[PDB]
Amino acid sequence: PLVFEPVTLESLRQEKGFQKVGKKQIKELDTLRKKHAKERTSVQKTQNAAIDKLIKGKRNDANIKNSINDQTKQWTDMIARHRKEEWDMLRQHVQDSQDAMKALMLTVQAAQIKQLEDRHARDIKDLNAKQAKMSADTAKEVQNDKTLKTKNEKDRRLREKRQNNVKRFMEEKKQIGVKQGRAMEKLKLAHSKQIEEFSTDVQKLMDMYKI
């Protein structure tokens, strides 16, 4: 409900509306980490078979030592594979979500303007109460003031105060109008700064996962 809140990428992530997609993405990846884990035991178990086939005779044969060397680079090649497979998904994760967030950023800022506008118009409404009460209570003062002499006399002074009063409201109404136009402008640009920045923060993230 806050009128000048920075809409950063991290902030965009916390918005309730993105929780559903965020939750889905965390699983999709977790399952793969599980898939990685199975792929490792399966290869690990397969690796073992070779010893039964090869070391049944039992004197360290020259061929076996080379073979075990050959196996190790088959593990580290799958280890290093599983690395890039996760990161590749992480970078691809961002791209799909980024399209969604852009559409959500817009409705977060637009929310800020609608919150401000209804706040502006209410400040307007409050001033008229100040103005309307102000004008009427002054008249009450005319009756209250003893110095009045005649009804024709009472009216004349009221008209004069009625001009001094209106000099204020014209300025007060004009001065307020400027403050609102300025307040919206300084806001409405911050939006188009946070948005020109967002396009290039998403990019900065994808590169971090690039390999």
Author numbering: 865 to 922, 928 to 1080
Paper text:
At the inner surface of fly photoreceptor rhabdomeric membranes, the master scaffold protein INAD (encoded by inaD for inactivation no after potential D and contains 5 PDZ domains arranged in tandem) forms stoichiometric multi-molecular complexes with phospholipase Cβ (NORPA), Ca2+-permeable transient receptor potential (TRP) channel and eye-specific protein kinase C (eye-PKC). In this study, we show that the PDZ45 tandem of INAD functions as a supramodule binding to the entire C-terminal coiled-coil domain and PDZ-binding motif of NORPA (CC-PBM) with an unexpectedly high affinity. Our biochemical and structural studies demonstrate that INADL PDZ89 forms a supramodule and binds to the entire C-terminal coiled-coil domain of PLCβ4 in a manner that is strikingly similar to that of the INAD–NORPA complex. The striking similarity between the PDZ scaffold and PLCβ interactions at the molecular level might point to an evolutionarily conserved molecular adaption in PLCβ signaling in the animal kingdom.
Confronted by this disappointing result, we decided to take a step back and tried to solve the NORPA CC-PBM structure alone first, hoping to be able to get some clues that might lead us to a way to obtain PDZ45–NORPA CC-PBM complex crystals (the structure of INAD PDZ45 was solved in our earlier study). Using lysine reductive-methylated protein, we were able to solve the structure of NORPA CC-PBM at the resolution of 3.0 Å. Like the coiled-coil structure of mammalian PLCβ3, NORPA CC folds into an elongated three helix bundle structure with an N-terminal short helix coupling to the middle region of the helix bundle. The C-terminal 16 residues (aa 1080–1095) that include the PBM is disordered and invisible in the structure. The packing surface of NORPA CC-PBM crystals involves an extensive surface composed of α1–α4. We reasoned that this packing surface might overlap with the INAD PDZ45 binding surface, and therefore prevented the same surface from being used for crystal packing in the PDZ45–NORPA CC-PBM complex. We noted that the solvent-exposed face of the α2 helix is lined with eight Lys residues, which are all evolutionarily conserved and required for the membrane binding of NORPA CC (and see below for more details).
